[PDB]
Amino acid sequence: DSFVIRGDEVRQIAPGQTGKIADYNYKLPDDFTGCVIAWNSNNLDSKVG
Amino acid sequence: SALGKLQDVVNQNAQALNTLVKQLSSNFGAISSVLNDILSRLDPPEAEV
Amino acid sequence: ASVYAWNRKRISNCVADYSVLYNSASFSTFKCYGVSPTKLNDLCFTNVYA
């Protein structure tokens, strides 16, 4: 499952977390089995304007 | 005191049950000896612990 | 306040809409020990000290 968030919200991609992203956008289960991988994408997803 | 032998039995049984019931007031390391309080304050991830 | 002189605000006799806090995007750290702020909505307390 792939998507984009902002850095401060990466912590919310984890079991037992709350916040905007975890509550309304993407929710992992409390007993989540699997891996979360995240990397900065400023060079690809940012624009001067 | 003549019937002490019978009284003993009774008392012993009573003591056992009393301790049993009083053991419901212990934490055993939990944050509260009341199951409903733990459930009212914690979501599953750590409520289960 | 400076950390050595940290301020303490007593919160009492009021309704605490904790959602305003835990739904906000303004925080980078929001870490609750021994409680879930969502369940705080269903609880009453005698002492609150921000």
Name every chain C residue with its beta carbon within 8 A of the beta carbon of A20. Answer: 23, 25
Calculate the CA dihedral of residues B17, B23, B25, B28 and round it to 10 degrees. Answer: -170
> CA A40, CA A43: separation in Å to the nearest integer?
8
* Interchain contact, A18 vs C36, CB within 8 Å: yes
> CA B18, CA B24: separation in Å to the nearest integer?
10
Cβ of residue C38 closer than 8 Å to a chain A Cβ: yes
Name every chain C residue with its beta carbon within 8 A of the beta carbon of B43. Answer: 36, 38-39
For residue C3, how far is the Cα from the chain centroid? Answer: 18
Experimental technique of record = cryo-EM
Q: Which 3 state secondary structure label does DSSP give A22?
A: helix
> CA C6, CA B14: separation in Å to the nearest integer?
55
CB C43 within 8 A of CB C32: no
Cβ of residue C32 closer than 8 Å to a chain B Cβ: no
Residue A21: closest CA among A29, A30, A11, A35: A11
Half-sphere exposure of A42 (CA within 13 A, CB side): 3
* Interchain contact, C43 vs B41, CB within 8 Å: yes
> CA B39, CA B36: separation in Å to the nearest integer?
5
> CA A31, CA A48: separation in Å to the nearest integer?
41
Looking at the complex, report in whole angstroms how far the Cα of residue C18 sits from the nearest Cα belonging to chain B.
14
